[PDB]
């Protein structure tokens, strides 16, 4: 809210009182935090793009996922993303230990809605199932590069305080594609983490209801690991209450 300060000389009683409104410092703090988080997320995204480049695949991401024949590259990209997320949670880890299998489904009767990437052991080693058609559909869905997204007082204050500044094939569309892939693989990684550390039955229960994620993860994630990418924003379904009533 507000505070005030009083200046006074030791030998004198003439005191000068000033008042401060903390809203200004609140704006400073909020702007600093927003900038810091934006920088962190952009750094992570750039790092992801850079390692994918390091793999040195000729085609762009969407073309790669469209090329059904080259399962090799799909598996490479998926594993690299999964390992990147794993390290982002455990920076000291740079490999994945146990070897990994991969399969690329091609039909609805082979895919599971809501979990394009999933895991299942063959009783000896873990296999990652990929819904390449779903990946292609997501990355191909037309994106909005125009509309903006969003207290009016602090909004205006930020508008008037913060400033603005007026050879890569990447547009905002490709950045969005990369972010979507990262988020999907992050969701899959959370499922896999719950699996590995709580058993296949717990993994199935999580698939049924993600809410268990709360405890099964926050026990370790919020404390020791970098926050989830989604943590950058609070997400919600438009007209959620009426939709639920429906």
């Amino acid at each position: 809210n507000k505070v005030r300060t009083v200046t006074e000389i030791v030998n004198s009683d003439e005191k000068i009182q000033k008042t401060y409104e903390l809203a200004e410092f609140d704006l400073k703090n909020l702007s600093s935090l927003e900038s810091y988080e934006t920088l962190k997320i952009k750094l992570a995204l750039s790092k992801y793009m850079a390692m994918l480049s390091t793999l040195e695949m000729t085609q762009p991401l969407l073309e790669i996922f469209r090329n059904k024949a080259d399962t090799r590259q799909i598996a490479a990209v998926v594993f690299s993303t999964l390992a990147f997320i794993h390290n982002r949670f455990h920076p000291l880890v740079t490999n994945f230990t146990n070897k990994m299998e991969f399969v690329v489904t091609e039909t609805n009767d082979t895919s599971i809605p809501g979990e394009p990437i999933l895991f299942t052991e063959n009783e000896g080693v873990l296999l990652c199932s990929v819904d390449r058609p779903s990946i292609v559909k997501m990355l191909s869905r037309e994106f909005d590069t125009e509309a903006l997204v969003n207290n009016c007082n602090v909004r205006i204050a930020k508008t008037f305080g913060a400033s603005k500044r007026k050879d890569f094939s990447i547009t905002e569309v490709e950045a969005t594609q990369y972010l979507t892939l990262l988020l999907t693989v992050e969701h899959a990684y959370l499922h896999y983490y719950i699996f590995k550390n709580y058993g296949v039955f717990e993994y199935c229960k999580s698939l049924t209801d993600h809410s268990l994620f709360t405890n099964k993860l926050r026990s370790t994630m919020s404390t020791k690991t970098s926050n989830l990418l989604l943590s950058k924003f609070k997400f919600t379904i438009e007209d959620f209450d009426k939709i639920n009533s429906n």
Binding site: R66, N67, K68
Partner: protein
């Protein structure tokens, strides 16, 4: 652009060096020859290559750097009956004329002289130089080729340099003179132009237009052409893909390699197609002696017929239809187990199948 008939222009590669012998006094209305000669040159340094002693016909000889006189309209230049006026490789409009006919000698043929009525074109047997783009070269001050004349006629690896403030027209004239010297070289000479690629491309375009003007004036065709930078890059890529060392293979020979295919397979080599496309951005057709048909980028065409047959010549509806196209594409996708990157197109046909 208009020119006064009083000017007579002679174009010859030889004019890279001034033709002292060809100069002759002009006569006035009274048929009195003028013993005063005025020689105009594009740059001051050029004066040093004009030997006044080589003008016995005249009694006084003066040399000056021709400069655009903004106060005189070239459509009607001032006349000076007191002297015979000769211009050597002019780069700016002639604002002054001499008694009788004002003589001009040039290795270049710019628009200014292009409309000139009297045009004498000297013909030469072509002799091409070698483009040797590469980062033991002999530097050459292009602004003053005659100074390096001995080296230009002896050595075969030249680094063409220019002063920073050299003008574009000066550059063009220097390059033309050097290329004439190479045209008279018995042995083709390799050269490298120490200039930005875009500047070199513009210079080549202007030289090509000059050669076109000479042809339109009746010059003999010369195979000693030049290649735009994009075309050179494409040729280099092709050579690298084939595993051909660039220094080992010359572009001309590289292209000639496919003449064995041109006629016998009656097909236009893709290299020639790409070069033609580059030039267009800056169609093909050919035949053989006694040949009844012409090979073109479009395929076989009856000689003298348009590049495309009448639209209704062939009916493609049977397969040139969405149903057939989709059927074939789906069959390909299924058989190859593909999901993208597949594209099938109906095949159209020109005059002949």
């Amino acid at each position: 652009m208009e020119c006064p008939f009083q000017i007579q222009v002679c174009i010859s590669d030889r004019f890279f060096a001034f033709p002292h012998n060809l100069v002759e006094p002009q006569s006035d209305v009274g048929n009195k020859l003028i013993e005063n000669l005025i020689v105009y040159v594009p740059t001051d340094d050029d004066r040093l290559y004009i030997d006044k002693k080589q003008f016995p016909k005249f009694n006084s000889v003066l040399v000056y750097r021709h400069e655009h006189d903004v106060n005189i309209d070239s459509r009607s230049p001032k006349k000076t009956a007191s002297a015979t006026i000769v211009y050597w490789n002019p780069l700016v409009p002639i604002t002054e004329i001499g008694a009788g006919e004002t003589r001009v000698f040039s290795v270049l043929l710019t628009n200014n002289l292009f409309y000139c009525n009297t045009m004498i074109v000297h013909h030469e047997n072509p002799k091409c130089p070698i483009e040797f783009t590469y980062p033991n070269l002999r530097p050459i001050a292009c602004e003053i080729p005659l100074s390096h004349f001995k080296e230009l006629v002896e050595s075969n690896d030249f680094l063409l340099c220019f002063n920073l403030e050299t003008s574009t027209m000066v550059k063009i004239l220097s390059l033309k003179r050097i290329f004439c010297i190479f045209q008279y070289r018995k042995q083709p000479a390799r050269y490298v132009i120490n200039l930005p690629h875009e500047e070199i491309d513009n210079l080549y375009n202007k030289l090509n237009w000059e050669r076109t003007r000479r042809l339109m004036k009746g010059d003999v065709p010369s195979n000693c052409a030049t290649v735009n930078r994009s075309s050179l890059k494409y040729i280099k890529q092709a050579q690298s893909l084939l595993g051909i060392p660039d220094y080992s293979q010359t572009v001309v020979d590289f292209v000639k390699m496919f003449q064995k295919i041109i006629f016998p397979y009656q097909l236009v080599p893709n290299v020639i197609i790409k070069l033609n496309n580059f030039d267009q951005m800056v169609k093909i057709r050919l035949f053989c002696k006694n040949d009844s048909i012409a090979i073109s980028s479009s395929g076989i065409v009856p000689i003298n017929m348009p590049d495309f047959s009448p639209p209704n010549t062939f009916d493609y509806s049977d397969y040139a239809n969405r149903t057939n196209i989709n059927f074939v594409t789906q069959r390909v996708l299924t058989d190859g187990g593909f999901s993208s990157g597949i594209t099938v197109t109906p095949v159209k046909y020109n005059y002949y199948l």
